[PDB]
């Protein structure tokens, strides 16, 4: 039987959603059902600035959206498979 | 065997049976 009433993710009343392809393995996955994680980490960080011009002017970072297909979301990234009633909680943390 | 491979196995079968008696067409 069903073991999610959403039974994909996040698509009610649309019929078809363009697919994205997974960062890890390139497998195709419907955009609505790709677990999305935005990775923003920045560019050892004071050695950077002492021996350098512009005395800490800007400090910019990576900005990048990530899409994994369940299979590879499950392998490493944030899936951490939940229990039967623990999984309906869509609180991010 | 998988369902859709039994489909393939049968589609093949009938294309072969279809052939065999157009011999006696």
């Amino acid at each position: 039987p069903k073991k999610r009433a959403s039974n994909g993710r996040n698509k009610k009343g649309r019929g078809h959603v363009k697919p994205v392809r997974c960062v890890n393995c390139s497998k195709s996955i419907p955009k609505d059902k790709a677990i999305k994680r935005m990775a923003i980490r920045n560019i050892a960080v004071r050695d950077l600035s002492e021996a350098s011009v512009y005395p800490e002017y800007a400090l910019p970072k990576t900005y990048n959206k990530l899409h994994y297909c369940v299979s590879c979301a499950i392998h490493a990234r944030i899936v951490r498979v939940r229990s039967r009633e623990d999984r309906k909680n869509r609180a991010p943390p | 065997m998988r369902a859709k491979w039994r489909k393939k196995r049968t589609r093949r079968l009938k294309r072969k049976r279809r052939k065999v008696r157009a011999r006696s067409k």
Binding site: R21, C25, S28, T62 | -
Partner: protein
């Protein structure tokens, strides 16, 4: 500077316009200990006279990078691996 996975690149030139060489076991080409080891002789020639692979797939810094001009598309040029991806 440009960082693959299983390589990192570094090269001086005029504003107008180093990899898996100091290490050779060829799994180590990415490794930071060799990014450094070949960054060393790079700043050397820097003073001796005076980017992720991206494009399509993984859009992300490599290991030997730290030890942006990343090419990103307008969502075209379908990626290798088919629709079932690399399978293990």
């Amino acid at each position: 500077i440009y960082a693959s996975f299983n390589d990192t690149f570094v090269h001086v030139t005029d504003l107008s316009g180093t990899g898996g060489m100091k290490v050779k076991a060829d799994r180590d080409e990415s490794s930071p200990y060799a990014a450094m080891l070949a960054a060393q002789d790079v700043a050397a020639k820097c003073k001796e006279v005076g980017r992720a692979t991206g494009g399509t797939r993984t859009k992300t810094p490599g290991p030997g990078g730290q030890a942006d001009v990343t090419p990103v598309p307008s969502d075209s040029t379908r990626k290798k691996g088919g629709r079932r991806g690399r399978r293990l």
